[PDB]
Design a protein around this ligand. Structure first.
Ligand code: LEK
Ligand code: ZN
Length: 196
């Protein structure tokens, strides 16, 4: 009923990484290590790095799923709001209900769980491009945290799982997400609040 969010590096040493994008008013996506929280604008590119200490097998996959952070809402499926699920902004692959999309990966697959009704998007694990030290997946979040009838200002977490070809767990990481109009300003505010 509630997927695990326990960090788990597993046998391959799996974990996420994030760019250092700053907090200027014009930034479209920025990650706060002190809050373990990503702030991004609606439907904008969010680069998420994948790191491992050793090479996983061919057919390893990487899945992303959103859940509500608060206890009283964890059982509710995170989905796009009644407006955005009907705004015909499909990319041809992502179902219009899904909050999380993968940008620019034709091997992305979108799951509606037959049992939990939860949504997820999964791509094959790939080695870094020649000359890079990690692999990057580009995610888009397709509703605002504030969207009425949808997330309705409730905070969410993204859970990233490394999986084998059967879907068995190999590694797990997670981060909070706020989809908002001004990520740089809101990251500065929430970090100030944390210190105060
Ligand atoms: C998880 C992304 N990633 C890395 C990230 C980071 C690194 C470390 N670079 C210093 C290596 C890999 C890596 C190697 C192989 C595969 C792979 C082969 S067949 C399927 N997936 C994937 C890899
Ligand atoms: Zn919405």
């Amino acid at each position: 009923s509630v997927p695990s969010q326990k960090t788990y590096q597993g046998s391959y040493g799996f974990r996420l990484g994030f760019l250092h994008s700053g907090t200027a008013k014009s930034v479209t996506c920025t990650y706060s290590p002190a809050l373990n929280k990503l702030f991004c604008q609606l439907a904008k590119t969010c680069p998420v790095q994948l790191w491992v200490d050793s090479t996983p097998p061919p057919g390893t996959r990487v899945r992303a799923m959103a859940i509500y952070k608060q206890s009283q809402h964890m059982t509710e499926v995170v989905r796009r709001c009644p407006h955005h699920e009907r705004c015909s902004d499909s990319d041809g692959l992502a179902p219009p209900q899904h909050l999380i999309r993968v940008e620019g990966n034709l091997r992305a697959e979108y799951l509606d769980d037959r049992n939990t009704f939860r949504h997820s998007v999964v791509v094959p694990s790939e080695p870094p491009e020649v000359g890079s030290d990690c692999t990057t997946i580009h995610y888009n979040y397709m509703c605002y945290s504030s969207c009425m009838g949808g997330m309705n200002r409730r905070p969410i977490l993204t859970i990233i799982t490394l999986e084998d070809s059967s879907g068995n767990l190999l590694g797990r990481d997670s981060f909070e997400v706020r989809v908002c109009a001004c990520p740089g300003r809101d990251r500065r505010t929430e970090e100030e609040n944390l210190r105060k």
